[PDB]
Design a protein around this nucleic acid. Structure first.
Ligand SMILES: [K+]
Ligand SMILES: [Mg+2]
Ligand SMILES: [Mg+2]
Ligand SMILES: [Mg+2]
Lengths: 179, 438, 46, 177, 188, 112, 178
RNA sequence: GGUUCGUUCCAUGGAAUUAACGUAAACCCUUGCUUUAUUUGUAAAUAUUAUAAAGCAGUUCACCUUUAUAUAGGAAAUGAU
């Protein structure tokens, strides 16, 4: 005797709620704060464009991930602890709710509230204030070192480290071709 | 005054005025525009194409990763299952089958779609449902029988600390150990199968897949009732079946085909063409001058000036009762909903949404098996078998004449092609499969 | 898969590496009929 | 001259600016003070904020001079308020709490306590009914996360009988076989 | 406890079944050029409509969608992985695009329009925008006076970023940004 | 041999030459600014003759891997180097098969 | 090292090997083997209370556990696979083996995968209609009217954005003045 | 046995009735027209090139001829289009 009773009407109605779903609520919410983080990082005169370019720089330091404030609050605790401790690099949280989830997920892990003072100025220095180093004009063509720095300062392809690698070998060559 | 540059962009005004013309020609209905996500696995466009050249390769990695994620199973020691330490390779079929992922990319996130056929829940649910209802009823009596004998005097209270509960909890386990391991065994196996679709475990897989696209991945796992509704799941089921040396190739195809139910059809009517006639019920043919300044200006009807009333005479309104009537709103924590959300009846809305979907019913099936599928361990010529049931044509265009939208310029919109490659002890073989929608 | 087996290995979940486990079965079969690899020589030929 | 042409507004009899106002107030009359109260008594507070702003943003004069009917293939085939989230025709709602990382699958000891806790919660509202036992195998979490009901990513299921699919199939299989 | 017979439905809902209303520009000076792109038309055509509906509530008079010339790439590859070159076939990748131009739009308001579109972006569409803004002379000063004004708006946003004291993994800050922007971009 | 990573980092199709072309793209990334200073001093006719002769000799001593002309695109799925498409990092064939299945976004069979 | 050997030393030791009643269990527990002195008092008071009830009360307990054993009897029964089975032909996991009675029948409650792409496309059109009916109107509360530039605004800068995408060309700034 | 670009179609056979693929249809480009959109394209403009989304269109009508009366075809710069 191996007989299974067909699903009862009560059971059917119960499964529907789980599979089909239920009539939940929906609360409209749209303020400039709910749109902050998705705006265009443009260096306009409007403060909104400058506040967004600073939020973008915090994401490049945090790892570069996009500002996703609607896809949950989960993350990788084992990897954020290594980056934050073993690499001593920054970490960007799209929301505070995501910051408290990593705290409750790790045994005695403390995440600093906010960045330090110097880090706030280094971000406003270049991303907001936009303070550069004007490449000076070189008149004489024999000014090798000065002429190279001019070209290296007028293009973002040559990074501070790449320019140093260049200047290292250059100065080594100029010094080896003298009497 | 004004800036000289602000004036040099105003004079550049040669714009064409919106004419609001009146249509004098009859318009036919538009085609059935199929979903965009079904054309390419990745529905994406990036302005920097250096984030687009790896997607074809990642797909293989993701699919292999997701395939192994839906096969996760408890360690036999965690459930006290007394693993049989055999050296054979078990060919298991009662697991979760998945299809090739289909990702909808955005600059902010990626929605990963995957169609599954949960064959493990079909068995676990029915079996655990055999447990009599008296088990929980009799178990509830032991909780009341143990709170009058062990935690009482002579045959929750302030004079009962938690220290006594620890010992009180072991006695129940001491007499029901072999019984609680059985219930817990099926409860965990069901929860595991249930959490593979919830965020309790998907948040772990999101991290592994988030290292390829560098975006938060959202999942849209779809459950299938039968495995014959997706070519990816069908060709993988037949492949595992044929991996056995003693598998009867030709007879396994007949069992699968017999499990495919095709809808009744009137051959003469199904193949009958359609005549082209002006459909005067179309919103474009009904009002040829769509300007509201002409439709509501007492054109033909009287005292229907209200715009809302006009819309009700064209669309099915859910808020109203009787399809056409009037909106009657009641005069003067809990969920924030309306005072009529419960009164709304989505009986005809379900019939409007699912009628505008084409290729719902499965109308075609084709299975091809090609490769080394012999029994004896020797060199033998290849084998080839083909079976089918129903047609893979696009009836709306092949017979009726309606215009279709081919996918990628060459593929039919209603056919799902998939190939699965496996190998026997003597060589490799493939399993192709076509599944079509009427 | 090795990085998926360690992410879910803390929850007591297991998963078979159908690729590696198949590669290991092919090697074991060869040793059965004495067709495996020879002892890796770690010295000059002499 | 404006961005739009008055050709369609001059034939009906709205050549003058004062004539277009008589049409707007007659056809697109604003909500009365009574309707607002009834509309604010049925919809929640937040839903009313978006309604009051829409009637100030969308001026009636625009609907008369350039308002036309929508006939594109992307228009919604039916009318609805879209106030709530429906079971099947809407994406599954995600209102649960995030999962716990340290949560582990219950053991025989923890499993017993959870089973005891479930037996005391239902015995405070014979014995356990089928609905309570059916809400324990499908909704009682066996993880050490305080019975969390995580938001499922499973797409909403379809009706018990899909329109266009039901009434066309016959079961070839026979229980007599 | 009575029933009120609503004369009409909310204008917000009635505006969803009409064509996207457009505001009239007084001067006609472009303030934004949003160019959408995709390999399909049903999502591009649809989002373009959704964008115009948001530009009306914000008072931005939008012009479009202007269908720009579609970009077509072509590749002819042999059907076989071997000698059989006499049999080839053509492939292509058509890029369908549109253009929504906003005239006489407030700078900050336009950034809200663009912010709203990115949050609710439709899958399979790439968007690029060019914003035009007027300004006085002496940009150096202006960009210096507005340092405190931006510090007040970021007071409640510094919580996102958090790092250990004296970050040692970054080293040279300016160099970190440069080479970390390449990695995310993909190389350039 | 000295530039081959002791721990494999390649996630695509691994090959004897795919592993050899990958070691050249990394060695050139480290020496590009240094290799561009030797090519600049050689072409700068304003510097002394000896200065340009020393750079010309040091550029010749750089390892072959450092040379950028040694880099050649390879299929990330097959490992071949003949008939590779820059837009897909695949052979003309692998592009075809994937384009028809739908794995390459946007690509469609062309008819006109 | 060497040829891999199997790992057969995998097993979970069950706590109890046979069902123990409160008396026997407490007796073995309170054998003065290893436990805190004060903790041994708790068990003692429990055992003392256990040996203070009527025989019938104890008798019922013995039958109560036997009634639970029969309640979970059909859950540990090895169901025999059907003669012409399809799913359990080579299933070496006796637990999952069911009767295969109406497990592959179509209840007319699903569409093909191709139909789910068009249904999931409607679930999104509603998600965008819900935004244009309830969230868009709130954008009018923060809009600001356009004001024409004065005589001092002589420059017209241009900034390009890629809407959340890193493109090297998103750093150029064009300026045009008369 | 006739017919058709075509196992197309009609009739018929003291054996037929049907299904799948190919064919056909449909699709992409192209042609005329209708509506929509007006920038980065267009001298002007009340919109007509261009750009591109959808829809309509043919052998359709007219003329002539025509079997077994069942299935049709011809004519091609001086019928319409
Ligand atoms: K620079
Ligand atoms: Mg015949
Ligand atoms: Mg222009
Ligand atoms: Mg034209």
């Amino acid at each position: 005797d191996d007989y299974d009773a067909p699903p009862t009407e009560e059971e059917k109605a119960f499964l529907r709620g789980l599979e089909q779903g239920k009539v939940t609520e929906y609360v409209p919410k749209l303020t400039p704060d709910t749109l902050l983080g998705y705006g265009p990082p443009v260096a306009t005169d409007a403060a909104l464009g400058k506040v967004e370019s600073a939020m973008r720089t915090m994401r490049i330091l945090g790892g570069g991930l996009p500002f996703n404030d609607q896809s949950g609050v989960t993350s990788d605790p084992t990897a954020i602890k290594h980056r934050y401790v073993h690499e001593k690099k920054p970490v960007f949280f799209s929301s505070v709710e995501e910051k408290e989830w990593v705290r409750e997920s790790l045994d005695k892990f403390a995440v600093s509230e906010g960045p330090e003072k110097k880090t706030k100025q280094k971000i406003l220095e270049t991303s907001v204030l936009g303070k550069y180093e004007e490449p000076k004009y070189v008149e004489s063509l024999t000014e090798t070192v000065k002429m190279v720095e001019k070209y290296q300062g007028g293009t973002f392809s040559y990074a501070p480290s790449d320019a140093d690698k260049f200047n290292k070998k250059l100065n080594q060559l100029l010094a080896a071709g003298l009497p | 005054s004004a800036s000289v540059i602000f004036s040099k962009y105003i004079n550049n005004n040669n714009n064409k005025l919106i004419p609001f013309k009146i249509k004098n020609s009859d318009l036919g209905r538009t085609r059935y525009f199929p979903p965009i996500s079904k054309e390419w696995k990745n529905s994406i466009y990036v302005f920097n194409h250096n984030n687009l050249k790896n997607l074809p390769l990642f797909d293989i990695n993701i699919n292999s990763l997701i395939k192994d994620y839906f096969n996760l199973q408890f360690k036999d020691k965690i459930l006290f299952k007394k693993k049989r330490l055999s050296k054979v390779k078990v060919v298991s079929l009662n697991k979760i089958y998945a299809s090739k992922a289909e990702i909808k990319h955005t600059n902010t996130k990626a929605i990963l779609t995957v169609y599954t056929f949960n064959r493990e829940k079909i068995s676990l649910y029915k079996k655990i449902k055999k447990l009599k209802k008296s088990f929980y009823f009799v178990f509830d009596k032991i909780i009341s029988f143990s709170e009058r004998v062990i935690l009482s005097g002579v045959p929750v209270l302030p004079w009962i600390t938690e220290s006594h509960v620890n010992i009180w909890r072991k006695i129940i386990i001491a007499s029901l150990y072999k019984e609680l391991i059985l219930l817990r065994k099926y409860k965990l196996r069901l929860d595991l199968n249930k959490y593979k679709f919830e965020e309790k475990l998907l948040y772990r897989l999101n991290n592994l897949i988030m290292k390829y696209y560098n975006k938060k991945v959202e999942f849209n796992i779809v459950n299938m009732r039968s495995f014959l509704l997706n070519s990816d799941i069908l060709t993988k089921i037949l492949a595992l079946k044929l991996k056995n040396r003693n598998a009867r190739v030709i007879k396994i195809m007949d069992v699968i085909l017999n499990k495919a139910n095709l809808p009744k059809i009137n051959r003469v009517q199904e193949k009958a063409s359609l005549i082209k006639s002006v459909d005067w019920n179309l919103l474009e043919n009904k009002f040829k001058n769509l300007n509201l300044s002409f439709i509501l200006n007492d054109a033909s009807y009287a005292e229907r000036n209200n715009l809302s009333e006009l819309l009700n005479k064209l669309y099915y309104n859910v808020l109203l009762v009787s399809q056409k009537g009037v909106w009657a709103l009641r005069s003067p924590a809990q969920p924030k909903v309306s005072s009529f959300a419960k009164a709304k009846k989505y009986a005809k809305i379900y019939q409007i949404i699912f009628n505008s979907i084409n290729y719902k019913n499965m109308g075609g099936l084709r299975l091809e098996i090609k490769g080394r599928l012999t029994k004896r361990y020797r060199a033998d010529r290849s084998l080839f078998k083909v079976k089918w049931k129903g047609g893979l044509k696009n009836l709306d265009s092949s017979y009726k004449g309606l215009s279709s939208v081919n996918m990628r310029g060459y593929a039919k919109p209603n056919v799902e092609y998939s190939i699965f490659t496996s190998k026997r002890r003597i060589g490799a073989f493939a399993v192709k499969g076509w599944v079509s929608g009427k | 898969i090795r990085e998926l087996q360690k992410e879910f290995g803390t929850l007591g979940l297991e998963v078979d590496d159908e690729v590696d486990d198949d590669r290991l079965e092919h090697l074991a079969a060869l040793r059965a009929r004495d067709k495996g690899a020879p002892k890796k020589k770690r010295t000059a030929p002499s | 001259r404006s961005r739009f042409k008055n050709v369609r507004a001059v034939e009906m009899g709205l050549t003058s600016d004062a004539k277009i106002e008589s049409f707007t107030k007659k056809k697109f009359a604003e909500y009365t003070e009574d309707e607002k109260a009834a509309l604010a008594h049925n919809y929640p507070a937040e839903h009313m904020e978006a309604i009051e702003a829409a009637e100030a943003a969308i001026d009636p004069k625009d609907l008369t001079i350039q308002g036309r009917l929508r006939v594109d293939p992307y228009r919604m085939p039916y009318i609805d308020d879209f106030s709530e989230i429906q079971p099947i025709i809407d994406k599954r709602a995600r209102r649960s709490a995030p999962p716990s990382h340290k949560a582990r699958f219950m053991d025989v000891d923890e499993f017993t306590q959870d089973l005891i806790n479930w037996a005391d919660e239902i015995r405070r509202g014979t014995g356990p009914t089928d609905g309570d036992i059916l809400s324990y195998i499908l909704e009682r979490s066996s993880m050490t996360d305080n019975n969390l009901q995580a938001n499922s990513s499973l797409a909403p299921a379809l009706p018990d009988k899909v329109p266009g699919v039901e009434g066309k199939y016959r079961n070839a299989i026979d229980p007599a076989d | 406890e009575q029933e009120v017979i609503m004369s009409r439905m909310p204008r917000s809902l009635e505006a969803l079944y009409l064509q996207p209303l457009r505001r009239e520009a007084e001067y006609g000076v472009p303030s934004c050029d949003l160019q959408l792109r995709s390999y399909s038309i049903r999502n591009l055509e649809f989002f373009c409509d959704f964008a115009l509906r948001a530009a009306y509530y914000l008072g931005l008079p939008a012009f479009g969608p202007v269908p720009l010339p579609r970009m077509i790439e072509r590749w002819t590859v042999p059907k076989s992985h071997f000698i059989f070159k006499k049999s080839q076939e053509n492939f292509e990748r058509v890029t369908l695009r549109r253009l929504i131009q906003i005239k006489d739009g407030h700078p900050e308001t336009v950034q809200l329009w663009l912010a709203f579109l990115q949050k609710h972006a439709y899958y399979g569409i790439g968007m690029k925008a060019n914003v035009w803004e007027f300004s006085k002379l002496g940009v150096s000063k202006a960009m210096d006076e507005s340092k405190s004004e931006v510090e007040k708006l970021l007071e409640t946003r510094w919580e996102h970023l958090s790092h250990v004291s004296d970050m040692k993994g970054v080293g040279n800050f300016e160099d970190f940004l440069a080479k970390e922007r390449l990695r995310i971009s993909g190389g350039r | 041999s000295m530039f081959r990573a002791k721990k494999l980092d390649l996630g695509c199709f691994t090959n004897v030459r795919v592993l050899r072309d990958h070691s050249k793209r990394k060695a050139f990334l480290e020496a590009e600014p240094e290799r561009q200073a030797l090519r600049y001093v050689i072409r700068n006719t304003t510097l002394p003759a000896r200065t340009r002769a020393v750079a010309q000799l040091q550029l010749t001593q750089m390892h072959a891997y450092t040379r950028p002309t040694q880099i050649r695109n390879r299929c990330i799925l097959g490992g071949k180097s003949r008939g590779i498409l820059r837009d897909f990092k695949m052979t003309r064939y692998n592009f075809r098969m994937n384009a028809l299945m739908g794995n390459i976004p946007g690509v469609k069979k062309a008819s006109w | 090292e060497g040829v891999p050997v199997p790992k057969r030393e995998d097993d979970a030791k069950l706590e109890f090997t046979r069902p123990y009643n409160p008396g026997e269990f407490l007796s073995e527990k309170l054998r003065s083997d290893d436990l805190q002195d004060w903790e041994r008092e708790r068990y003692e008071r429990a055992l003392t209370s256990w040996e203070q009830t009527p025989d019938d009360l104890k008798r019922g307990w013995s039958t109560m556990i036997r009634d639970i054993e029969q309640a979970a009897a059909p859950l540990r029964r090895v169901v025999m696979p059907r003669r012409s089975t399809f799913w359990y032909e080579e299933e070496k996991d006796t637990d999952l083996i069911t009767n295969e009675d109406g497990e592959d029948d179509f209840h007319e409650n699903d569409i093909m995968s191709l139909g789910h792409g068009k249904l999931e496309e409607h679930r999104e059109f509603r998600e965008y209609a819900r935004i244009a009916v309830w969230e868009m109107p709130l954008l009018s509360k923060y809009a600001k009217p356009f004001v024409p530039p004065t005589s001092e605004e002589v420059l017209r800068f241009r900034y390009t954005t890629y809407m959340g995408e890193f493109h090297p060309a998103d750093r150029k700034v064009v300026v045009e003045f008369c």
